[PDB]
């Protein structure tokens, strides 16, 4: 909490196929959120998998 982020891309950005990206600087923690209307374990697929 409180903590924030800035540089989303940092190599770890590869942890998302097509979704939101967010890297907690102060809390070095690479984590990219999905997007929407997509699919896949990490949002690799795009729809067709409701």
UniProtKB/Swiss-Prot annotation:
The EGF-like domain, residue ranges? 4-44
Q: Which organism does this sequence originate in?
A: Homo sapiens (Human)
Localized where? Secreted, Extracellular space
Extracellular topological domain residue ranges: 1-50
Q: What is this protein called?
A: Transforming growth factor alpha
Question: Taxonomically, which superkingdom?
Answer: Eukaryota
Q: Which cysteines are joined by disulfide bonds?
A: 8-21, 16-32, 34-43
